[PDB]
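Replying to the earlier thread about multi-chain prediction with a worked example.

Input:
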Amino acid sequence: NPQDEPLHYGEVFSTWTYLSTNNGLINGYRSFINHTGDEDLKNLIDEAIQAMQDENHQLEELLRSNGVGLPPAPPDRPAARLDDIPVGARFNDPEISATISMDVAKGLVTCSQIIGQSIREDVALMFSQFHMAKVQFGGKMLKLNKNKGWLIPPPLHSD
Amino acid sequence: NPQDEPLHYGEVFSTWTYLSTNNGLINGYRSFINHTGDEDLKNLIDEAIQAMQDENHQLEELLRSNGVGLPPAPPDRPAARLDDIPVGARFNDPEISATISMDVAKGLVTCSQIIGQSIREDVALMFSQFHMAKVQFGGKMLKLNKNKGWLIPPPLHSD
Amino acid sequence: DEPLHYGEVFSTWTYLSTNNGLINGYRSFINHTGDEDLKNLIDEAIQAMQDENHQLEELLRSNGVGLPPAPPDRPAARLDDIPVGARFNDPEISATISMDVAKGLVTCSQIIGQSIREDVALMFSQFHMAKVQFGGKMLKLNKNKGWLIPPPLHSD
Amino acid sequence: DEPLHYGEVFSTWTYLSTNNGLINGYRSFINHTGDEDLKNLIDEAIQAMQDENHQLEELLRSNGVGLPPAPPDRPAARLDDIPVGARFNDPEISATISMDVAKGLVTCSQIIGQSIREDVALMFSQFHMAKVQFGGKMLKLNKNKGWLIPPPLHSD
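Result:
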């Protein structure tokens, strides 16, 4: 029974940190919903928020069951009208999408790091599942960026 | 003469990507200046922007001298009044600071990655210098977060 | 039909090169191994990397990229012929491989996240899943053999 | 006076453990090495890790954290006594160490970025600088010896 073994310090710190990262990203993405015009991007931000909330439910149960204090999360946000945001304070759709895409890429790496350092099998499996879901979400972001013409092409190999 | 040798594909992609990352962060941080109340945080955001612009000058010269196309950067931003930002669109000081601190930590890692994969000595040395500066800036961010009471304490070891 | 980007080429060429190096190293480790449960897992790792390499070599060759050098043939050796100071012991070998697998998970995720060509992202997502399963087998071996060094433990 | 956080303890204990493993492995590599310029650099790496380890063991001991096991004594061996299939050759050894150094740079940066205690950040910033210099020596060796495999090159 994996959950009758203690977590190690790395497992505790990494999962606590991941949960805190999610809390911060939920808050930022809730702000991005208010800054976004594009409805396709908005839908994906909403999906990301929900996905992180699902991850959080599992993480919080893990930490609560193992006597680890939870990190404080920023609160939910009011709605705002897009046209009321001063231009200099406004995040635009391509840059919102870029940010989220980079966040997803970083999250893939963090999942792999946690799996690699895990000794409790349940922790490894949780992050394996998170990684599988995040690969799919990342693929949706790439499709969006392609469809919208937001992707900046890097230097290309000539065959 | 290092600069008479061709860059390898990794050096090109990594430096191009780093420059693009800087361009995006400059744009986001210019928006954060408009969202910030705290003058100490504002000063550090301004310092970060200037530091990235200095890095960019070197990166752009490297790429321009080696026949690599530069990534397009978002433009500069107008000033905005803090009180005109709808609450639901507003980024608050602790969360701005957290974001920048995470960005700095990620940048340290990216610098080390580039140094490690470098074969041209000038590329390794450039990133070594960037890393040294970024360590100092990161230490200033930590001091800020401590001073302001913005740092969330992680689980602590009991000796 | 879309070209690979510089990062896709560099990352895939480097991952292939890494596998080639690890196949050579692990072939040597097989000659240093006493424990046959460990040996069987090294064999599995080698075959898996060889399987990945067929896919990567095809991708690179089909896109006009020169391949890194293949692993050389390596003969068997008798464990007992290895001088003591030159011998890697079973827990040392296991720790090395375990660390290599953990690193490789991270590399796969890095490649996925920087890929624009969907076929590259797909390939490395499949490699990642395989490495998750393999790392899981290594962990079970290390626990079963008593080779794992416990890190600092949280107390609930 | 401030306690270490869980990440500081886990990261420092793990970095120490890693150094201990690499000291053992590199001692073995010395016995496999023909080239004396390579051997001298392995000796330098070992001594450097030992120097880091004195600092880390003190930090951990002073904060009530149990230390990981120290490297065991490892005798010398004659290169010519190593069966061919068990022998790591000079370029293989060099590639391994070069990769270890690159990984170690990244680990140092990771520890710096997650540190809250200034003394931990300072320590790893100093280790990082040392590894930058050492990796630079490894690269020069690999170039001088003709061991570097060129990756795909950009054309200006």
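Chain C has one domain: 1-147.

Feel free to reuse this layout for your own posts.
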